Amino acid sequence: MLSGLNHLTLAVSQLAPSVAFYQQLLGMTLHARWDSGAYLSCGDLWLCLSLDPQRRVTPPEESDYTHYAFSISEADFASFAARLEAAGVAVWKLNRSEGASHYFLDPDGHKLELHVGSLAQRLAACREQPYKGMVFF
Amino acid sequence: MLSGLNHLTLAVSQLAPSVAFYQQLLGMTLHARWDSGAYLSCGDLWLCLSLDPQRRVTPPEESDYTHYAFSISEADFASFAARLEAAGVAVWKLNRSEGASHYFLDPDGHKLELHVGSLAQRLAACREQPYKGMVFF
Ligand SMILES: [Mn+2]
Numbered sequence: 001m002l003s004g005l006n007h008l009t010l011a012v013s014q015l016a017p018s019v020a021f022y023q024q025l026l027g028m029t030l031h032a033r034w035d036s037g038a039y040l041s042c043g044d045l046w047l048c049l050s051l052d053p054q055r056r057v058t059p060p061e062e063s064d065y066t067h068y069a070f071s072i073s074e075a076d077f078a079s080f081a082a083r084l085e086a087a088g089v090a091v092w093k094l095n096r097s098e099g100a101s102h103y104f105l106d107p108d109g110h111k112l113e114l115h116v117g118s119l120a121q122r123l124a125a126c127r128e129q130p131y132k133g134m135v136f137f
Numbered sequence: 138m139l140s141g142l143n144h145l146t147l148a149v150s151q152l153a154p155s156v157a158f159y160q161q162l163l164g165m166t167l168h169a170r171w172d173s174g175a176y177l178s179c180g181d182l183w184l185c186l187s188l189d190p191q192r193r194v195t196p197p198e199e200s201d202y203t204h205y206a207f208s209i210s211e212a213d214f215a216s217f218a219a220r221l222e223a224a225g226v227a228v229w230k231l232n233r234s235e236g237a238s239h240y241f242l243d244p245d246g247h248k249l250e251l252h253v254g255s256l257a258q259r260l261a262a263c264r265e266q267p268y269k270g271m272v273f274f
């Protein structure tokens with residue numbers, strides 16, 4: 001039986017700017033680094049950055065909707081978004097769903113998100129206003 | 138600050154086979170589905186499958202090392218891996234370069250992993266058998 005997400009590994013084209021982005025800009029804790037990768041944590045999340053020459057710096061129009069959302073409190077959301085904006089981090093989507101969301105790109109074009117709100121909160125909103133074809137279990 | 142992973146969203150090309158893979162084959166909990174997506178949980182992971190016409194079924198030699206690992210206990214690991222193998226689930230990696238792991242593909246070629254152990258345990262293992270150039274903070 002699977003008990004949760006063990007780790008998220010992102011392939012990166014250049015290790016130093018990716019470490020700078022996740023550790024310094026996004027405030028994650030750097031636990032270890034080696035010639036071809038790094039381990040960071042963000043709350044319970046174990047993040048691995050893996051240097052991979054096959055990673056392309058990918059424009060958002062050229063990747064699908066797969067994306068990775070990090071939790072932040074409502075009270076902290078606006079100043080964190082402003083920090084990303086000051087740093088020139090690109091946005092790939094505007095928020096049109098429930099709960100604050102900021103959609104931003106990492107240095108290689110990985111699609112990231114800041115989101116406020118849990119699955120329970122989303123399900124409650126969906127029960128009141130179900131998406132087309134929505135069934136609950 | 139950021140406090141962990143709020144959700145993982147995977148773009149999928151065909152919603153029903155992807156729901157079946159995560160719910161039936163991997164045993165995740167299905168909470169809701171709709172014409173364009175589904176919400177599942179795996180422990181405290183919120184997984185969203187999002188139907189995306191841009192998603193392509195991608196062979197593992199065509200994608201980079203970005204991957205998603207799910208936690209499993211030492212007692213359950215081998216039989217779960219063997220069940221996936223017997224079910225014909227495609228693979229993408231064989232060499233255990235980061236501990237006890239089984240590397241397998243979802244229907245669209247998303248790179249998945251079963252892994253036994255925490256970040257703390259992986260750091261302790263790496264102190265004895267470190268990756269080249271490894272530094273610990
Ligand atoms: Mn999202």
Ligand SMILES: [Mn+2]
Binds near residue numbers: 206235
């Ligand atoms: Mn892994």
